[PDB]
Ligand binder design. Structure first.
Ligand SMILES: [Zn+2]
Length: 257
């Protein structure tokens, strides 16, 4: 039902998912001049050396690069987090043109795209249990701008032709997500939600300050994907982002001065 089309997009989601108007919805605008440096926050610990990617899937709203999360391999720890969060998948949000695509914004600036690396809290045993808890997920968000190519993205780019339509997947082993990080891991953090239905309020957001650069050719391949299934009317997979939601009673904390 829900999507990013002309009649089922973010402004409609609240009908079926009333949590869309909840108290800790994502994404949000990050006001750089009211996010406060928090000296109690720690450097992120991104431990991806043993990551095992398995598969890439077009799910009709993005594509997910899926990992083996059946044991502690690729984990996120530290930062604002207590305990250990296992990497399950990453995906992107992007626009029809370079001036929109990100979910989070920075002083109202929209980036061309945003990468989400999704991790679940091992204290809850499985992902399905984790999403029912306020500290169940940690999502590392990384902005993309268009300029130079990102070498470590090309292997993703080049498989997209094989998963054009919803429900298609392809083997995708030995991909190293470290090639998608910027140089600095300085970040903002706040409590929020998943950004598409069911919009569960289970996420500690960790949004990196420094964007990565990808090329116009790389982004153009993203924009050739389809929301639709094989043989159905073609709807390009573009503008798969939810706009910023009210901050309400939340504070955005910065890891950096
Ligand atoms: Zn996302």
């Amino acid at each position: 039902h829900w999507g990013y089309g002309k009649h089922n997009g973010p402004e409609h989601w609240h009908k079926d998912f009333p949590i869309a108007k909840g108290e800790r919805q994502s994404p949000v605008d990050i006001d750089t001049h009211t996010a406060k440096y928090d000296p109690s926050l720690k450097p992120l610990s991104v431990s991806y050396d043993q990551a095992t990617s398995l598969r890439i899937l077009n799910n009709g709203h993005a594509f997910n690069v899926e990992f083996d999360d059946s044991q502690d391999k690729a984990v996120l720890k530290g930062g604002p987090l207590d305990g250990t969060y296992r990497l399950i998948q990453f995906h992107f949000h992007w626009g029809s043109l370079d001036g929109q695509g990100s979910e989070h914004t920075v002083d109202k600036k929209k980036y061309a795209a945003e990468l989400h690396l999704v991790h679940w809290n091992t204290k809850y045993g499985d992902f399905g249990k984790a999403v029912q808890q306020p500290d169940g997920l940690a999502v590392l968000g990384i902005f993309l701008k268009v300029g130079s190519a990102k070498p470590g993205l090309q292997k993703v780019v080049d498989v997209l032709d094989s998963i054009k339509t919803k429900g298609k997947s392809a083997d995708f082993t030995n991909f190293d997500p470290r090639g998608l990080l910027p140089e600095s891991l300085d970040y903002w953090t706040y409590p929020g939600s998943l950004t598409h239905p069911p919009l569960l309020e289970c996420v500690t957001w960790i949004v990196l300050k420094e964007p990565i650069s990808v090329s116009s050719e790389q982004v153009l391949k993203f924009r050739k994907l389809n929301f639709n299934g094989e043989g159905e009317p073609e709807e390009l997979m573009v503008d798969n982002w939810r706009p910023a939601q009210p901050l309400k009673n939340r504070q955005i904390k910065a890891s950096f001065k």
